[PDB]
Amino acid sequence: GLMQFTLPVRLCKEIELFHFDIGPFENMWPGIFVYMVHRSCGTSCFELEKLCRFIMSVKKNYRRVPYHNWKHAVTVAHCMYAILQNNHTLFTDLERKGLLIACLCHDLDHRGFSNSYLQKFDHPLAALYSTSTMEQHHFSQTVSILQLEGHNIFSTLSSSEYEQVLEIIRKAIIATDLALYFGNRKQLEEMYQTGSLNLNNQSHRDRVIGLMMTACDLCSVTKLWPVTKLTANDIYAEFWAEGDEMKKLGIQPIPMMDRDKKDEVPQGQLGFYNAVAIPCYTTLTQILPPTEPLLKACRDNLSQWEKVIRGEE
Numbered sequence: 074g075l076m077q078f079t080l081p082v083r084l085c086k087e088i089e090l091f092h093f094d095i096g097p098f099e100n101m102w103p104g105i106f107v108y109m110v111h112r113s114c115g116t117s118c119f120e121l122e123k124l125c126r127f128i129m130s131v132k133k134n135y136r137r138v139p140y141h142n143w144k145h146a147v148t149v150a151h152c153m154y155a156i157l158q159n160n161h162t163l164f165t166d167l168e169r170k171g172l173l174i175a176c177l178c179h180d181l182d183h184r185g186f187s188n189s190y191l192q193k194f195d196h197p198l199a200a201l202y203s204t205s206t207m208e209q210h211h212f213s214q215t216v217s218i219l220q221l222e223g224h225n226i227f228s229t230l231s232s233s234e235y236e237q238v239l240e241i242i243r244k245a246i247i248a249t250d251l252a253l254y255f256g257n258r259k260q261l262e263e264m265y266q267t268g269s270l271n272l273n274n275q276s277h278r279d280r281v282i283g284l285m286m287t288a289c290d291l292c293s294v295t296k297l298w299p300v301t302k303l304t305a306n307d308i309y310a311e312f313w314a315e316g317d318e319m320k321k322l323g324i325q326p327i328p329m330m331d332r333d334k335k336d337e338v339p340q341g342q343l344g345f346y347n348a349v350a351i352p353c354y355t356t357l358t359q360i361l362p363p364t365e366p367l368l369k370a371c372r373d374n375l376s377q378w379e380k381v382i383r384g385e386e
C-alpha cells in the first residue's frame with residue numbers, strides 16, 4: 074500500500090512531458106508503467122502483485138519485431154499518461170484505469186504485418202475477423218491474459234464497472250485501426266465546428282477516446298527529431314519486410330513498402346504527416362487544448378522531413 078515507485082530525477086521530470094523517450098534499458102519499462110498508473114490512477118487502483126504479473130504476461134506476448142514491440146506498447150501508454158495528466162478533470166476513474174491498460178495491450182501479438190497483408194495471404198485471423206483483423210486479435214489476447222489465474226487486475230471492480238472497463242478497452246483498441254481514424258476525425262471535426270460536440274454524450278466520448286488512441290499510437294511523429302528519425306528506420310524495416318512478402322505472393326507492393334524505393338521515403342513522410350498526423354493532432358488540440366505540444370512537435374518534425382528532401386540533411 075505504501076510502496077511507491079520512484080524514478081531518477083531526470084526521468085521523474087522528463088516523464089511528465091509529451092516528448093519523453095522511455096530509453097534503451099528494457100528492465101526499467103515495467104517500473105515506468107507502474108509509476109505512470111500510480112500517478113494517473115492512484116496506488117490503490119490495482120493490487121501491485123497482480124499488476125506486475127499482468128505487465129510481465131503482456132511483455133511475453135509482444136514479439137521481437139522492429140517496431141510493433143514491447144517498447145511501442147510502453148511508448149503509446151506514456152503518451153496517454155501525458156494526455157490524462159494534462160486533462161485532469163475531464164476523465165472518469167474507470168477511463169484512466171482502462172486507457173493505460175488499453176495502450177499497453179493495443180498491439181499484443183503483432184507480427185509486423187498490416188491487415189491488408191493478412192487478407193492477401195489469406196491468414197486464418199482474416200477469416201475469424203473480416204475488418205480490424207489485428208485489432209480484434211489484440212483485444213482477444215488482452216481478455217485471454219486477464220483470465221489467467223492471478224492476472225485479473227480489475228477483480229475488485231463491481232460487475233457493471235468491470236463490463237464498463239472491458240467495453241472502454243475494446244473500443245480503444247479497435248480505434249487504433251487507422252482505416253477507422255479518417256471517418257472518426259471527420260465526424261469530430263464537423264461536431265466541434267457546428268458546436269454539437271458534447272462530452273456527457275457517451276457516443277461523443279467514445280469518438281474522442283478513439284482520436285486520443287490514434288494520437289498516442291502515432292506519437293513517434295511528436296518526439297524530438299533524433300528519436301523520430303531513428304524510429305522511422307524501425308517503422309520502414311517492417312514495411313519493407315511486408316513488401317518483400319507481397320512480392321513472394323506475386324503482388325508488387327505500394328512504393329512505401331518496396332525496399333528498392335528508399336529514395337521515396339522523405340516524400341512518404343510528408344504524405345503521412347499532411348494526410349494523417351497533422352490533422353489528427355489539430356482536431357485533438359481543438360478538443361483538448363492542453364495536448365497542443367503534440368501538434369507543435371509534429372509540425373517541427375514535418376519541417377525536419379522537408380529539410381531532408383531539400384538535401385539540407
Ligand SMILES: COc1ncc(C2CC2)nc1C(=O)N[C@@H]1CCN(c2ccc(Cl)cn2)C1
Pocket residue numbers: 251252290291292293294308329341342345
Ligand atoms: C508512412 O507511414 C508511417 N510513417 C510513420 C509512422 C509513425 C507513426 C509511427 N506511421 C506510419 C503509418 O502508420 N503508416 C500507415 C501506412 C499508410 N497509412 C494508411 C493510410 C490509409 C489507410 Cl486505410 C491505412 N494506412 C498508414
Ligand SMILES: [Mg+2]
Pocket residue numbers: 179180207249250
Ligand atoms: Mg496496431
Ligand SMILES: [Zn+2]
Pocket residue numbers: 145149179180249290
Ligand atoms: Zn500501435
